[PDB]
Amino acid sequence: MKKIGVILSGCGVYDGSEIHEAVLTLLAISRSGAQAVCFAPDKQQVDVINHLTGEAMTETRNVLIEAARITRGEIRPLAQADAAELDALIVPGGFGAAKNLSNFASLGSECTVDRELKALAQAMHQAGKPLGFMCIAPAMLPKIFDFPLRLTIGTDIDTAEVLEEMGAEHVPCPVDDIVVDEDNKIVTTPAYMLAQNIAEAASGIDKLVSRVLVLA
Amino acid sequence: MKKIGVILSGCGVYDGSEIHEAVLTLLAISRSGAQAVCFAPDKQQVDVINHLTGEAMTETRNVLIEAARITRGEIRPLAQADAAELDALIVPGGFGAAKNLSNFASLGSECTVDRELKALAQAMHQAGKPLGFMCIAPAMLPKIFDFPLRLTIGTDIDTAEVLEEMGAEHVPCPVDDIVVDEDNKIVTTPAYMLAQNIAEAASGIDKLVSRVLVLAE
């Protein structure tokens, strides 16, 4: 039974993990007979967004407490993740990826990544285990790995430019396909960077999870 | 495309809509070539639960603002739902169904259902449009319709008895099947009342969505 670590960043596209992407990732893992082992950093969200209006709210929420809603409570602090107990790592998207897992949303090419996440992904890569990042999550890759990688965030020219400025080789990719850095076993897919509906998002995520499991 | 109204009650199993059930419902609607039209009542949730610990929190949240998370902002107040603009209605589960869409959680067989939801369900049924309820959501049916209905919440002995006490014909049903009251076009399935994992929940939910869509066609 393969164990796939799934890293969340809250519960909702604007301040945490993209709910559809996280649930579709869990569905693909389950359908394939693998076990999803979910984590999230135990810290306060950088903000709380009203998803009906798009505006910031005057309240505070904890990343892990909120991410527990997506997993029905089956989640642990990211501090408890151990690369030796996992076969693959997948990071769904959502703005939380650029706000809580890193500060890419505010720093761009000068951002930094959550230290527990960075250490975990580096340990996974040193053991030859596959990583899967989607939507805006791939933007952290050039800050986790100090070596070039072929990746994709879809087709957005400005975002693509920022990734190239960070040293990555951006590869344009439609919503129903993936980009793989074969030598480093890193799989990326655009998901909601381009998906026009949930079925579209699911086609790319299903392909990403499948490739990650094969690599595992 | 058929317009399928999806009613949400918050964002999370313990104090709103079951997130996997709501997303799997949207996935099946979208994959089947139909259009999801989402709503939630604009009112404060009865409670806020820390899903890591299961403990009640000392904060308050709005059902609609939280349900907007599941729908990427694509949702309206339940007051704006118009039966004439919809072809079918589906209510995902989660404890929010028993707390925000009704007070089944605290009143059981003496509960009442959100007035807007009841009215919208009655209007759809009067027009011969199908309804789909899953998990604990079918517990509201005896309080929406004043005639016996064939439905299921799975196999829970206690809950089944409460439904029979409310006048329903409770039909034991596994996670991968559905129960349909054919004369009234009502489709129910257990989802997380029994699912052990998300693939199991998806199996029953896809069957319910497919039957609702056939009934709407």
UniProtKB/Swiss-Prot annotation, chain B:
It catalyses: glyoxal + H2O = glycolate + H(+). GO terms for cellular component: cytosol. Homodimer. The keyword NAD does not apply. One of its GO terms (biological process) is isoprenoid biosynthetic process. It comes from the Bacteria. Keywords: Lyase. It is an enzyme of class 4 (lyase). One of its GO terms (molecular function) is lyase activity. InterPro entries: Class_I_gatase-like (IPR029062), ElbB (IPR026041). The keyword Lyase applies. This is Glyoxalase ElbB. Displays glyoxalase activity, catalyzing the conversion of glyoxal to glycolate. However, this apparent glyoxalase activity may reflect a protein deglycase activity, which could be the primary function of this protein like other DJ-1 superfamily members such as PARK7, YajL, YhbO and HchA. Is not able to use methylglyoxal as substrate. The active site is at residue 135. Its EC number is 4.2.1.-. Belongs to the peptidase C56 family.
